């Protein structure tokens, strides 16, 4: 059993924030990234670090697309484009999903049970790493 907290919803406006101070450590970077999240019950603005924003840039997320951001692992997943925007184009490749229910933030725990041998097999073969 472990508890996870997730922010999910449609992205309203996301903006980077760059620091004018060079600091000597980097040539160019950002201090923080603010990304707004919209949901049926309510809307909330979040303040994120440049890394978890870099993940969003890897997901190629644009304004109006539902995203899934977990606090524990810090992973960002794009579910799909919002349903209301579907009528914009006649033909579209992207799938459409409704806006997530819930205010913004959610607290949930997972009671999943797993055998020890499955821990051994998952321990033998790693799923991690991007190496060729």
């Amino acid at each position: 059993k472990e508890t996870k907290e997730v922010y999910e919803g449609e992205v309203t406006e996301l903006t980077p924030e760059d620091a004018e101070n060079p600091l000597g450590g980097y040539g160019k970077t950002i201090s923080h990234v603010i990304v707004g999240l919209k949901s049926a019950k309510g809307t909330k603005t979040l303040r994120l670090d440049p890394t978890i924003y870099e993940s969003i840039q890897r997901e190629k997320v644009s304004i109006g697309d539902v995203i899934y951001i977990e606090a524990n692992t810090g992973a960002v997943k794009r579910v799909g484009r919002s349903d209301a925007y579907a009528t914009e184009f006649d033909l579209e490749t992207e799938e459409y999903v409704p806006l997530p229910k819930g205010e913004v933030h959610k607290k949930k725990e997972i009671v999943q049970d797993v055998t020890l041998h499955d821990l051994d097999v998952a321990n033998a073969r790693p799923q991690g790493g991007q190496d060729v």
Binding site: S82, A84, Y85, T87, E88, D90
Partner: peptide, 18 residues
């Protein structure tokens, strides 16, 4: 609120064809 485009006859949104 987002924009909604519908047909000019019956307002069908399932098939949008100009």
């Amino acid at each position: 609120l987002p924009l909604i485009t519908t047909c000019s006859i019956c307002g069908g949104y399932d098939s949008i064809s100009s």
